[PDB]
Structure formats: structure tokens, C-alpha cells
């Protein structure tokens, strides 16, 4: 889970 | 497909002219909030997403915020309000370029309605002030307490004007009928310095009172006919029209 | 992308001029809290992040405190108020340099307004004090109890002034009409030592009473016509214009 991947997942989840 | 037209300062601000028989192609990128602005006074009724989960929707009055919450979030937004129903084709952008920060609407019919009314008001004021082709009566006499007398008095066939000097207290003017009885008449105080009292009637005799002094004004050229009021306003060039319909 | 310009003292404090059709560069480094300040009296209505977890948000009226909380925090904040909507594009800086501690906005329209008001106020005060183009009436005579008498009485066409000595009590001054009835008239007390009573009317006869002594002042050059008050103020060099609109 590269920082880009975690950034994308946080981006999607966040309200 | 009406594509939002980009501004001149930035690409992130794009304007769209509303079209009921067309949709809005919103190119949303990942991780931003697109601010769609409704018209003022527009009351949001209901909305409907293609996926309630693909995009995150929060609305405050006429302010719309959406935010993608999934991959490949290609759905539709049909938000319907009391005035109209918007149509969006939310097409996700994969490379995260050319974002759409806020969608602003232009309404052609509303702008036409507002500019027609303003032009009508301008024409109305021009016609009220032009005051062309009026006939003035200056055969007025007076007898009584001359210290409260007007410096001039005339009428244009619809109203009677009494002009008072700058130092004179403005008195009270009463309508006098055939038997000599007096009755109130409505007045409007006009003039640059408020020196003119305009009473809303043409009459042969008038009564001017201030305290315990009295002056009688006599119209020596009373026209029993006058000019009819066909328009509904005080001017022959401004019609009063029925708006309320019903 | 309104990339702003820094201060002349510290590159951390950077000013930008608001533009409704462009967004604002903000470069946030880790561990710093940026202050975005609203215009005075502006009410925050709604704000919207791209990633609500990436940044930390705290607000106290028109003072908005923001902070990063995650890596690669590249999103935007759109905070909307009753007057306008702010447009940011928050891009995090990797090497923790070139931080912003607070953002400031310059509003061309508000500045243009409030600078006009001060100049207009200075011009208005100068116009009142200039007091030119005045004609003075000095043909005033008196008869009665000369121990309450003014040392000087005159009028400028609009007001009537009675000047009293330093050792004399200031009496009441009344308006005498044609039949001899006295009635109240508004007065203002002008002069450096409050020795002048300015009544707001020109009249041929005045009555001065103090206790049980009475003095009658006569205007022996009464001008019924006067000079008209076209401007709405006490001076012909200051207009009174309608602000409330409506």
C-alpha cells in the first residue's frame, strides 16, 4: 500500500 | 450535452446557460468538491442520484456540494426544485486534470424578464417627466387674510397647484362646494424646495386656513368638463394596466 | 490560480486580492496552522473540503484556522458566506518551506466605497464651514424690558440669530404670528461661548420672555419671499441625498 494508494483511499472515503 | 464554458481567469470556474431540453456535462475529478449554485429564492424540492453511494451530497439552501466516493462513478444527478429540474451527467475524470470547482448557471428568460421591466420603468419615468401638451389655467383670485396667500396658483386641468414663498408656513387647503361647506381634499407637496401644494381636484372655490386666519381662492375659469382620465395615471402617456389577472 | 504576493518583511505573510472568477493558491507545509480571515462582519454559511480527513478545520466567527493532517494533502476548500464564496486549491509542500501563517484578502469594491465616504465627509464639513454667498438682515428693533435684550440680532435669510452678552441669562424666544399669538419655535444654541440662539425661522415679530419680563423684537425689513431650500440642508453647498433607496 504505497502512499499514493493510501492517499487515494483516504480521498475516496472522506466525506 | 451542454458543456460548461470555462472562464477567462481560470479553467476551474465554468459557466453554463440553462436549457430545459439539454443536460449538464460535469467533468468531476477525484477528491474535490464541486459547488453548484442555484438561482436565488429557488426552493430545493428533491434530488435523485444514479448511485447514492458513488457521490457524497450535502446541500445548504441553494448551495450544492457533491464529492465522488467511489471508482468509476459514472451516474446521473436529477435535482428537481419548485422552478425547474436540473440534469447532470457525472463523468469521472481519470487523470485528475481540468477540474470543475464550481458550476454557475445563467438563466436567459429571467435576465430578459428583468431587463424588460427595467426598460419599462425607464420609459415610464421618461414619460412622466416629459409632460408634453398640457394646458394651464391662471385665472385665480383671492380674498381674505393675504398674509397666508400663495405667491402663485394655477392648474393643469387635473390638479391645482398653490406655490408658497420660502418663508411662509404651508397652510391647510380645503375644498369648498356650492353651498359653502368645506371638506378635506387630498394633497401632495411637490416642488424642489417643497414650496408647492398640489391638490387632486379642479374646483371653482378653495379655502386656505392657518390657525385663525382664512383666505378664499376663486377659480375664474372653471371648466366643468376638464380632460378625461383614460389612462389611469396622472399622465396621458403612461397607461395603468391590470397585472393581477385572476 | 491567483498566486499571491508576499509581505515586505516576512515571506510567510502573503496578500491576495479577491476575484469571484478565480481560485487561490495555498501551499501548506506540515505542522503549521494557516489562518484565513474573512471580511469584517461576514457570516460563514457552509464550507466543503475535498478530503475532510486531510485537513483540520477550526472556525471562530470570521477567523478560520486550518491545518494539514495527512500526506499528499492536495485538495480544495470552498467556504461560502452570505456575501461571497471563497475558492482555494490547497497543495501541500513537501520540504516544509515557504509556509503561510495567515492569508489576507483585499476587496477593491469595499475599499473604493469606504474611501469615498471619508472624502465626501471631509468635503461636506468644508462646505458647511465655508459659509459663503450669505446676505444678512440687521434691521431689527425692540421694545419692552431691555434687561433681557440681546446685544445683537440678525438673520441670514434662513435662520434668525439673537446674540446675548456673557453676563445675561438666556431667555425663551417665541414666534408671534399676525394676530399676536405666541407659539414655540425650535432653537439651537450656536457660538463659541454659547451666546447666540439661532431660531429656525424668519418672522417679522418675535417675543422674548424670561421670568416675568417680556421684550418684543421686530423685523423691520421682512422679506416674505426668502431664499428657497433646494438642497435640504442649512447651506447651499451641501446636498442631502436619499440613501435608504427602497
Nearest to B167 among C45, C80, C226 (CB): C226
Q: CA-to-CA distance for B151 and B165, rounded, in angstroms?
A: 6
Q: Hey, are the CB atoms on B56 and A12 less than 8 Å from each other?
A: no
Chain A within 8 Å of B68 (Cβ-Cβ)? yes
Q: Hey, are the CB atoms on A12 and B69 less than 8 Å from each other?
A: yes
Q: Is the dihedral of CA B173, B179, B181, B186 positive or negative?
A: negative
Q: What end-to-end distance do the CA atoms of chain B give, in Å?
A: 39
User: HEC string of chain C?
Assistant: CECCEECCCCCCCEEEECCCCCCEEEEECCCCCEEEECCCCCCEEEEEECCCCCEEEEEECCEEEEEECCCCCCECEEEEECCCECCEEEEECCCCCCCCCEEEEECHHHHHHHHHHHHHHHHHHHHHHHCCCCCCECCEEEEECHHHCCCEEEECCCCEEEECCCCCCCCEEEEECCCCCEECCCEEEECCCCCEEEECCCCCEEEEEECCEEEEEEECCCCCCCCCCCCCCCCCCCCCCCCCCC
- DSSP single-letter state for residue B148: G
Nearest to C72 among A3, A13, A14 (CB): A3
C68 to chain A, closest Cα gap in Å: 13
| Residue with cell string 374646483 | B203
Q: Hey, are the CB atoms on C72 and A7 less than 8 Å from each other?
A: yes
Nearest to A15 among B30, B56, B71 (CB): B56
Tell me how crowded residue C115 is: count the other CB atoms within 10 A of its CB. Answer: 10
Longest dimension (CA), chain B: 95
User: HEC string of B169-218?
Assistant: CCCEEEEECCCCCEEECCEEEECCCCCEEEECCCCCEEEEEECCEEEEEE
Chain A within 8 Å of C90 (Cβ-Cβ)? no
Count CA within 13 A, CB hemisphere, residue C51. Answer: 26
Contacts of A4 in chain C (CB under 8 A): 72
| Residue with cell string 453676563 | C167
Q: Hey, are the CB atoms on C229 and B12 less than 8 Å from each other?
A: no
C-alpha separations of B98 from A12, B101, C161 in Å: 19, 9, 75
Chain B within 8 Å of A4 (Cβ-Cβ)? no
Resolution for this PDB entry, in angstroms: 3.2
Q: CA-to-CA distance for B16 and B63, rounded, in angstroms?
A: 16
CB pairs under 8 A between A and B: 12
- DSSP single-letter state for residue B24: B
The residue in chain B having the minimum alpha-carbon distance to the alpha carbon of residue C183 is B211
Q: Are C139 and C154 in contact (CB under 8 A)?
A: no
Q: Is the dihedral of CA B78, B81, B82, B84 positive or negative?
A: negative
Q: Hey, are the CB atoms on C21 and B8 less than 8 Å from each other?
A: yes
Contacts of A15 in chain B (CB under 8 A): 56, 67
Which residues of B lie inside 8 Å of C (Cβ-Cβ)? 7-10, 12-13, 31-33, 35, 37, 58, 60-61, 63, 65, 67, 101-102, 145, 147, 151, 165-168, 192-195, 211-213
Q: Which of B132, B119, B195, B201 is nearest to B160 (CA)?
A: B201
- This structure was determined by cryo-EM
Chain A within 8 Å of B69 (Cβ-Cβ)? yes
Chain C within 8 Å of A8 (Cβ-Cβ)? no
Q: Hey, are the CB atoms on B30 and A13 less than 8 Å from each other?
A: no
Residues C88-110 as b/e (b if ≥16 CB within 10 A, e otherwise) read bbbebbeeeeebbebbebeeeee
Amino acid at each position: 500500500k504505497t502512499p499514493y494508494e493510501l492517499a487515494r483511499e483516504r480521498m475516496l472515503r472522506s466525506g | 450535452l451542454d458543456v460548461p464554458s470555462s472562464s477567462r481567469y481560470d479553467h476551474r470556474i465554468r459557466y453554463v446557460t440553462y436549457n430545459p431540453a439539454d443536460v449538464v456535462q460535469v467533468d468531476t475529478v477525484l477528491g474535490v468538491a464541486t459547488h453548484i449554485m442555484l438561482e436565488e429564492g429557488e426552493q430545493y424540492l428533491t434530488h435523485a442520484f444514479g448511485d447514492s453511494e458513488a457521490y457524497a451530497f450535502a446541500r445548504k439552501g441553494r448551495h450544492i456540494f457533491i464529492k465522488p466516493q467511489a471508482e468509476l462513478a459514472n451516474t446521473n444527478l436529477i435535482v428537481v426544485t419548485d422552478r425547474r429540474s436540473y440534469k447532470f451527467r457525472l463523468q469521472m475524470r481519470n487523470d485528475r486534470n481540468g477540474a470543475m470547482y464550481e458550476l454557475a448557471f445563467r438563466y436567459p428568460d429571467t435576465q430578459a424578464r428583468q431587463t424588460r421591466e427595467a426598460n419599462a420603468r425607464a420609459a415610464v419615468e421618461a414619460a412622466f417627466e416629459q409632460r408634453v401638451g398640457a394646458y394651464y389655467n391662471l385665472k385665480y383670485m383671492m380674498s381674505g387674510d393675504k398674509d397666508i396667500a400663495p405667491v402663485n396658483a394655477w392648474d393643469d386641468g387635473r390638479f391645482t397647484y398653490f406655490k408658497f414663498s420660502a418663508n411662509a408656513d404651508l397652510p391647510s387647503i380645503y375644498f369648498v362646494d356650492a353651498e359653502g361647506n368645506e371638506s378635506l381634499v387630498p394633497r401632495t407637496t411637490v416642488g424642489s424646495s417643497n414650496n408647492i401644494i398640489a391638490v387632486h381636484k379642479v374646483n371653482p372655490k378653495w379655502m386656505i386656513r392657518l390657525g385663525n386666519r382664512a383666505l378664499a381662492i376663486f377659480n375664474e375659469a372653471y371648466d366643468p368638463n376638464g380632460v378625461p382620465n383614460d389612462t389611469g395615471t396622472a399622465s396621458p402617456a403612461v397607461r395603468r394596466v391590470n397585472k393581477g389577472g385572476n
